[PDB]
Amino acid sequence: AMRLSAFFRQFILQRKK
């Protein structure tokens, strides 16, 4: 159940980044 592709710092962080 992993969608998380370019994960990290881009989804979670998409808003900070």
Tab-separated table of N, CA and C in Angstrom:
chain	number	residue	atom	x	y	z
A	1	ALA	N	0.846	-1.224	0.000
A	1	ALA	CA	0.000	0.000	0.000
A	1	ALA	C	0.855	1.237	0.000
A	2	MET	N	1.804	1.315	-0.958
A	2	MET	CA	2.675	2.460	-1.040
A	2	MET	C	2.380	3.180	-2.286
A	3	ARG	N	1.972	4.421	-2.090
A	3	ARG	CA	1.715	5.295	-3.163
A	3	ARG	C	2.893	6.170	-3.217
A	4	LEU	N	3.354	6.447	-1.994
A	4	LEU	CA	4.438	7.305	-1.713
A	4	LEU	C	5.569	7.024	-2.676
A	5	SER	N	5.635	7.885	-3.713
A	5	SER	CA	6.626	7.757	-4.782
A	5	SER	C	7.784	8.707	-4.560
A	6	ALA	N	7.631	10.019	-4.935
A	6	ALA	CA	8.710	10.999	-4.747
A	6	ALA	C	8.763	11.314	-3.289
A	7	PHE	N	8.410	10.342	-2.423
A	7	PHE	CA	8.266	10.687	-1.061
A	7	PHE	C	9.384	11.313	-0.406
A	8	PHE	N	8.838	12.204	0.377
A	8	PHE	CA	9.467	13.020	1.260
A	8	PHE	C	9.986	14.228	0.684
A	9	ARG	N	9.653	15.185	1.512
A	9	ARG	CA	9.919	16.529	1.366
A	9	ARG	C	9.310	16.971	0.118
A	10	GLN	N	8.008	16.639	-0.012
A	10	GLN	CA	7.384	16.933	-1.213
A	10	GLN	C	5.907	16.669	-1.110
A	11	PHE	N	5.447	16.303	0.096
A	11	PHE	CA	4.064	15.956	0.278
A	11	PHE	C	3.630	16.358	1.600
A	12	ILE	N	4.590	16.165	2.432
A	12	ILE	CA	4.503	16.379	3.784
A	12	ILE	C	4.962	17.723	3.993
A	13	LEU	N	5.858	17.942	3.098
A	13	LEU	CA	6.703	19.000	3.092
A	13	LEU	C	6.485	19.888	1.942
A	14	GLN	N	5.609	19.454	1.093
A	14	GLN	CA	5.242	20.168	-0.105
A	14	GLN	C	4.916	21.603	0.183
A	15	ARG	N	4.361	21.841	1.363
A	15	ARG	CA	3.918	23.147	1.725
A	15	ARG	C	5.037	23.973	2.292
A	16	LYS	N	6.110	23.316	2.744
A	16	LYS	CA	7.211	24.032	3.350
A	16	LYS	C	8.222	24.168	2.286
A	17	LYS	N	8.221	23.146	1.453
A	17	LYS	CA	9.118	23.076	0.330
A	17	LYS	C	8.416	23.713	-0.879
